Tab-separated table of C-alpha atoms and ligand atoms in Angstrom:
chain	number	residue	atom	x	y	z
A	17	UNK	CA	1.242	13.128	-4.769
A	18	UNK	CA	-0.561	14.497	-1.885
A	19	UNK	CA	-0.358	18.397	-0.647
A	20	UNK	CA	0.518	17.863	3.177
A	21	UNK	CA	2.255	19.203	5.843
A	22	UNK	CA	6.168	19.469	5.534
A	23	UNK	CA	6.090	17.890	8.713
A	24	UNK	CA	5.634	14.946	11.070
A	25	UNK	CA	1.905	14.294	11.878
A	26	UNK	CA	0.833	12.671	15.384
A	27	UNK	CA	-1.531	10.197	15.752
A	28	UNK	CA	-4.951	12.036	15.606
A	29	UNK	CA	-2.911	13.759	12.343
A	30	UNK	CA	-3.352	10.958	10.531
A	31	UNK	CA	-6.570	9.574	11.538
A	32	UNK	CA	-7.709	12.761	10.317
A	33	UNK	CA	-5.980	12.533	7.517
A	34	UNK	CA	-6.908	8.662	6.062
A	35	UNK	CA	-10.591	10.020	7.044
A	36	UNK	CA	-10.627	12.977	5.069
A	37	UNK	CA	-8.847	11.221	1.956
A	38	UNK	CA	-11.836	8.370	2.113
A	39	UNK	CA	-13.923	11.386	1.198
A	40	UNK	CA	-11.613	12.500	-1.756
A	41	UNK	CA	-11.920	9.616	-4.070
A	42	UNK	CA	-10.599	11.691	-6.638
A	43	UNK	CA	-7.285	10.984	-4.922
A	44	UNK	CA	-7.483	7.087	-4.955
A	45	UNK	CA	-10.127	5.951	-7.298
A	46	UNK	CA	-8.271	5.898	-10.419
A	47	UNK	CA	-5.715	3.036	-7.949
A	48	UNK	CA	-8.992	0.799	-7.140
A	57	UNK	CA	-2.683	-4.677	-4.689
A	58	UNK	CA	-1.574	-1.285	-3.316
A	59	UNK	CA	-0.962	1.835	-4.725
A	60	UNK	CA	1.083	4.753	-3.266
A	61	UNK	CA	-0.955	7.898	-2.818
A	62	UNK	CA	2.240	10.340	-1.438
A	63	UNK	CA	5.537	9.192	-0.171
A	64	UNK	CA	7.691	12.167	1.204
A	65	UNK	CA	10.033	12.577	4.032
A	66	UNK	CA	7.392	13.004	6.167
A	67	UNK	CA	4.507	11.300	5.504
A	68	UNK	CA	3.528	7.998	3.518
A	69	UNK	CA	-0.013	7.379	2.195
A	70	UNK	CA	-1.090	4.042	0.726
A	71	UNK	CA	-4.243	2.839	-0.854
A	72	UNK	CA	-5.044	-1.051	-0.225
A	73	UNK	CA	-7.255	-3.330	-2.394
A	74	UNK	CA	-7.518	-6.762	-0.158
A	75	UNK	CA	-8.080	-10.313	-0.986
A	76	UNK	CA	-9.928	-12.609	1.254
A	77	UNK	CA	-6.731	-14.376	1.859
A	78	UNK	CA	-4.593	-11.537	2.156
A	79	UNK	CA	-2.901	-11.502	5.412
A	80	UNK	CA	0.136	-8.941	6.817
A	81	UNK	CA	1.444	-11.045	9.614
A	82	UNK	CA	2.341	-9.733	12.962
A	83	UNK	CA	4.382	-6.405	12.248
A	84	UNK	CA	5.447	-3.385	14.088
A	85	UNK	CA	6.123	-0.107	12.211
A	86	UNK	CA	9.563	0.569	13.935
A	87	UNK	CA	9.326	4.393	14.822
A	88	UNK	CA	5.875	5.466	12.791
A	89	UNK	CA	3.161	6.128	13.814
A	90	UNK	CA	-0.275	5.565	11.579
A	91	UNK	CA	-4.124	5.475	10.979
A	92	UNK	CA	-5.951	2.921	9.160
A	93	UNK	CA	-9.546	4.232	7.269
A	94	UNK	CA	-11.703	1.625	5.780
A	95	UNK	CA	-13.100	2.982	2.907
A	96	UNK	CA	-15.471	-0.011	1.758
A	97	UNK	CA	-15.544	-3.705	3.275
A	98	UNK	CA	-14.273	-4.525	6.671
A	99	UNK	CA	-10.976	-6.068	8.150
A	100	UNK	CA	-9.564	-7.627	11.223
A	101	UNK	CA	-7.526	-5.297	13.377
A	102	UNK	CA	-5.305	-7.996	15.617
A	103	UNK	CA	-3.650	-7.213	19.035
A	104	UNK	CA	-0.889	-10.267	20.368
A	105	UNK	CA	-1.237	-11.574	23.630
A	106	UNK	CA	1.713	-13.075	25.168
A	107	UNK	CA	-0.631	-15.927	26.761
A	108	UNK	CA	-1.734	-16.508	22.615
A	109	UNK	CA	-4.918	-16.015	22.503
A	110	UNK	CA	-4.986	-12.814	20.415
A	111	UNK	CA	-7.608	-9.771	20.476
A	112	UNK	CA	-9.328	-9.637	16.732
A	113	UNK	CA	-11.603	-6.628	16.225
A	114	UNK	CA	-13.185	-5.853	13.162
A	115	UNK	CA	-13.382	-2.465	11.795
A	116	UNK	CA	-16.099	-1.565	8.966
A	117	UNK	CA	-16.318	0.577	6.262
A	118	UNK	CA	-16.384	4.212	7.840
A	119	UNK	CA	-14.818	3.088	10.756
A	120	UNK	CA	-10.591	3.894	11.152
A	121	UNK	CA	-8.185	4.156	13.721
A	122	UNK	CA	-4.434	5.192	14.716
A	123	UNK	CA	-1.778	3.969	16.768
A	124	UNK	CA	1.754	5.361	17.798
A	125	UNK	CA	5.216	3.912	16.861
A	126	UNK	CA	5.088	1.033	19.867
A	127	UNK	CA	2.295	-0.528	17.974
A	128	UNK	CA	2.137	-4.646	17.172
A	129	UNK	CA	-0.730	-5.278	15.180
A	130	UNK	CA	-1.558	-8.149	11.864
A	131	UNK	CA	-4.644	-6.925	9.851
A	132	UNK	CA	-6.470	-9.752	7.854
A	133	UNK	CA	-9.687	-11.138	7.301
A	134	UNK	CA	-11.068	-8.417	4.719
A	135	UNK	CA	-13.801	-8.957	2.878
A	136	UNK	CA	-12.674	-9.520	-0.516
A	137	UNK	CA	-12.894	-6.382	-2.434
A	138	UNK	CA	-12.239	-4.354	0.848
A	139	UNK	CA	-10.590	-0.918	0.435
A	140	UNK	CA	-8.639	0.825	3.021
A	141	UNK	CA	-6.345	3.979	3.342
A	142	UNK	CA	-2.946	3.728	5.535
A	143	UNK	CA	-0.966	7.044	6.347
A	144	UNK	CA	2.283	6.389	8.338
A	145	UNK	CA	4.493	9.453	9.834
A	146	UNK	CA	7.712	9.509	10.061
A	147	UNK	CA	7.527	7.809	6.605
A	148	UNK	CA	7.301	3.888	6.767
A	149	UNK	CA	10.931	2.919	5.675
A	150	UNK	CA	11.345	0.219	8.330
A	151	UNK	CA	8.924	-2.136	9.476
A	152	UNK	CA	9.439	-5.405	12.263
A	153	UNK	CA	8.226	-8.691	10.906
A	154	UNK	CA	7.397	-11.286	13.685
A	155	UNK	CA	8.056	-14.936	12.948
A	156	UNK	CA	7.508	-18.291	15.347
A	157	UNK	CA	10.185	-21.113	14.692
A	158	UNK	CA	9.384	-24.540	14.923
A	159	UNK	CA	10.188	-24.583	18.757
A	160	UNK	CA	7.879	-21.347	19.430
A	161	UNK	CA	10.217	-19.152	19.991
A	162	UNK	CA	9.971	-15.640	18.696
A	163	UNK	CA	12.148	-13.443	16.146
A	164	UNK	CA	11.766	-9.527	14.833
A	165	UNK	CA	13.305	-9.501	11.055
A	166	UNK	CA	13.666	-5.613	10.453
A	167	UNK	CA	12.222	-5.061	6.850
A	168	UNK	CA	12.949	-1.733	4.985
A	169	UNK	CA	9.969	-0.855	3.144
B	201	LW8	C1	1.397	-1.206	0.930
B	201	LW8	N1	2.655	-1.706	1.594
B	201	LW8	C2	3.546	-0.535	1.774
B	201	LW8	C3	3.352	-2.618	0.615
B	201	LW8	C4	2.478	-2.357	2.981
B	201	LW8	C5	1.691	-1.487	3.977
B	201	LW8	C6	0.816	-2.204	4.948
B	201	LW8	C7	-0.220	-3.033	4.760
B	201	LW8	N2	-0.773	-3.267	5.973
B	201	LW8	C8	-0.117	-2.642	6.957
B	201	LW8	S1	-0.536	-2.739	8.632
B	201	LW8	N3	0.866	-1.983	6.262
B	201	LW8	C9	2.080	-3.858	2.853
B	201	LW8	O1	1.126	-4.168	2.101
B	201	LW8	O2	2.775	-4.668	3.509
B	202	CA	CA1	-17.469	-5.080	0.142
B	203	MG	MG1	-13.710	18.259	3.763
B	204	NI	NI1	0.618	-2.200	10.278
């Protein structure tokens, strides 16, 4: 695992963190498709390989808050709009950034080959999958994780 904090981070906590690991590839290169880097009762640290196709959906992270680093590549960070024409933003290699726990967000559109580091605190155990029936209409599945 990781040596961290026995302790919730905040937001800036983990942006620092996910930054600092991209500059530590001794703690992720042998993982370069996901790979746990630290799961604890405090924090969770992943290490994502992405797929052109790859796509999360619309999600929430239930009550934790996180901080996305891309390490090489680039992504699409997605914000919903009720009206449905969603905000896409694409964050490059170099480039992170966090969010707290009310956060609704789909990340997709990597380059293939792109690598990025998640960190989630209080530990990601729960996450809120959006769906759209047939008629529109909206549903949250909870999802432990
Ligand atoms: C690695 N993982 C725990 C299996 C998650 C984490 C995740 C990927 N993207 C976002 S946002 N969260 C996932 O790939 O869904
Ligand atoms: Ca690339
Ligand atoms: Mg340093
Ligand atoms: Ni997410």
């Amino acid at each position: 695992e990781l040596d961290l904090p026995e302790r919730n981070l905040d937001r800036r906590e983990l942006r620092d963190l996910v930054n600092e690991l991209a500059a530590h590839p001794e703690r992720w290169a042998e993982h370069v498709h996901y790979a746990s880097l630290h799961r604890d009762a405090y924090v969770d640290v992943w290490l994502l390989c992405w797929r052109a196709e790859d796509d999360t959906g619309w999600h929430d992270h239930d009550i934790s808050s996180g901080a996305v680093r891309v390490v090489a590549g680039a992504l699409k960070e997605c914000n919903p709009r009720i009206g449905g024409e969603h905000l896409e933003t694409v964050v490059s290699e170099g480039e992170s950034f966090s969010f707290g726990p009310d956060h609704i967000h789909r990340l997709t559109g990597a380059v293939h080959g792109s690598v990025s580091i998640h960190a989630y605190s209080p530990p990601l155990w729960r996450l809120g999958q959006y769906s759209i029936d047939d008629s529109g209409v909206m549903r949250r599945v909870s999802v432990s994780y």
